[PDB]
Ligand binder design. Structure first.
Ligand SMILES: CC(C)(COP(=O)(O)OP(=O)(O)OC[C@H]1O[C@@H](n2cnc3c(N)ncnc32)[C@H](O)[C@@H]1OP(=O)(O)O)[C@@H](O)C(=O)NCCC(=O)NCCSC(=O)CCC(=O)O
Ligand SMILES: [Cl-]
Ligand SMILES: [Cl-]
Ligand SMILES: [Cl-]
Ligand SMILES: [Cl-]
Ligand SMILES: [Cl-]
Lengths: 255, 266, 257
């Protein structure tokens, strides 16, 4: 399709693109892709045939949007900033917010190019570009939804929860929290880990691709994915000689 | 008429209340209750006869204050918001701030209906509606004091500490941190856990009602309360077959003068 | 009438009982203000490494502490976000020219206090940097991270999301928390109380280090405190009690590159 081809050609030529040197065609393809992300009409990853697939060209558009803009002053006084990515809600009035159907509790901020669905509550928190936050999700205080992350419907991201961004590598799927999950306070899920639907993480669960996930029912370690309905708590596995343990995640039940 | 009685009847009638139809009697009682919370004249829970007591009617007022207001735009420039609870300080002038006796370090925010006592320092942090933060307490950077939480005097909530909110169920006591406690960085205390006076939590202690609290000196496991004078650190308990352990909280000792020196050094 | 900064500060420190916002000589106020200016610009720093040893400049900490005593709280804010504090924010009044000269990025709603140095090519995601901190070139401060007072962060450091680096102002003689060049500090980790993480080290998510934390070297079985040796990879773990009934969490060095 139109946008994708233009973005892919611009990507190959990115060494020659700058905020002062970019064609109308390139600028417009990037802007239209960011617009589509901001409205949820495009998404960095989606679930097709029961498998999450990533659209690398959309990540390329996001990265180009950084290359095509200089930093600019934003704000005033004790809240003065300098960045090249617009915030999502600058210039919104009552009509735009009423239309979006979500709440933005001060001092929450999202970047333009993140999609926030109806009935979401953003307590003070941060939602980065490319993220998709689906209907009914609660993002609690000092939580973070990182770049490109896909948050399902009726998810609860508790206080201080971090969902790690994945813009580069281009080939890598983003971090995914599927529908109805509860992610307990202080937990972190990063690096493209997939938490499948209906799962529960206790407080303080830290998952990357390298984290051992010990399944108490089977005695086996796995990585990168929490099966649907799993209850995951922090634990540890002992060394062979008994001198120490290393922390891991433990699946204690599956519902 | 009686403020509590007005609130209790409005609660029974809550299905028929909205931002466009509610009697003046009802709007005035809710607003007066939130005003009392904001000023510290009312509090959601209080300690009486050595026990924490919750005032359900004050929680009912907080919940009605959500039902009685629509979301509204607030904010300037790049920081634009949309919510139905006013921030605490939007209408404060220099005289109000001078009179309060506390400090609010940018970009800290509290909601209207939270009480902040004299000599408190709010580093960048969030204090939610119904919370009470008593005298001399330090709320450090990116900490959170959740809805209805009661924080005692001379408490140190370290960086990134979360005190969980409790509104529903109405009868449930809020999360309580009693006087002179130190709560180490990244710790979370939620769901009405009580940390009793003169206790110290190390970094990374996570307490809910289901967390095992293992007392090293007695080998006993308890839930829901840190006994006064306890030092609590992260640990774990082994499974019966030895294949793995599950993290828990461990009371390793009681607070001694060395503990006090280390939790006041900076 | 006007002396160098250090002498003026040390003199004023001895009189710190008699000093307030209303009574304070112009000489003392100017000296404090100029010391903070130097911190803000990176011309001065609370601690620096000399002869391969980190040393602290107590007089600079004295100036920071005096800056609190000499200033009243002041209103500041906009719209629903209203504050009241005695330490100015770093970027008040900055336009394009000041930010272009600094060479760093400040992503809303990140805030830093005046008296923190931010080097070129730093990215401050929403985060906080307190007075006296020094954040060196190319470092990434990720979302809801904190660089506490006087902390020294080296070049090309990655402070991941929710990382806290603890402040050390008092005691005067104590070295601040130090994260040396090229370190990666994983999400939710905390390094406080003057712990030193030496260059090229990697902390996994959820590593909490204070002076009281056991650092268990898996290769040797040895426990140490207060310092991560250069090149160490550190993860959360635990050590078992003598009777086997429980374990206590610690940091474990799993390898060293
Ligand atoms: C919790 C405390 C305060 C412990 O204080 P104490 O000096 O009383 O205890 P201690 O003797 O150091 O420790 C008692 C026992 O618990 C263990 N232990 C200590 N801290 C631990 C931790 N975080 N996680 C797991 N175990 C821990 C010790 O190894 C020891 O085990 P054994 O009994 O088996 O030897 C510590 O974590 C600390 O120093 N925290 C504050 C650090 C900080 O950020 N300060 C800022 C200044 S605020 C102004
Ligand atoms: Cl699934
Ligand atoms: Cl091992
Ligand atoms: Cl078990
Ligand atoms: Cl800080
Ligand atoms: Cl032990």
């Amino acid at each position: 399709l139109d946008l994708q081809t233009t973005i892919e050609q611009a990507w190959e030529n990115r060494a020659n693109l700058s905020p002062v040197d970019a064609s109308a065609e390139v600028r417009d393809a990037v802007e239209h892709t960011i617009d589509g992300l901001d409205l949820g009409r495009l998404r960095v990853a989606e679930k097709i045939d029961d498998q999450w697939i990533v659209h690398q060209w959309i990540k390329k558009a996001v990265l180009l949007s950084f290359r095509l803009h200089d930093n600019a002053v934003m704000g005033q006084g004790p809240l003065q900033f300098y960045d090249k990515v617009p915030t999502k809600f600058a210039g919104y009035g009552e009509a735009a917010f009423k239309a979006g159907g979500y709440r933005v509790v001060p001092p929450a901020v999202a970047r333009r190019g993140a999609f926030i669905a109806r009935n979401v509550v953003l307590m003070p928190s941060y939602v980065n570009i490319g993220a998709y936050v689906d209907e009914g999700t609660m993002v609690d205080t000092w939580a973070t939804v990182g770049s490109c992350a896909q948050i399902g419907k009726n998810v609860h991201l508790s206080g201080g929860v971090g969902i790690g961004g994945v813009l580069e590598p281009l080939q890598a799927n983003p971090t995914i929290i599927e529908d109805n999950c509860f992610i307990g306070a202080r937990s972190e899920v990063v690096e493209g880990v997939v938490v499948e639907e209906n799962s529960v993480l206790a407080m303080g669960v830290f998952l990357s691709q390298s984290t051992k996930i010990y399944d108490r029912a089977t005695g086996k370690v796995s990585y990168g994915r929490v099966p649907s309905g799993s209850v995951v708590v922090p634990g540890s596995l002992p060394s062979e000689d008994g001198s120490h343990s290393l922390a891991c995640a433990v699946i204690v039940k599956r519902v």
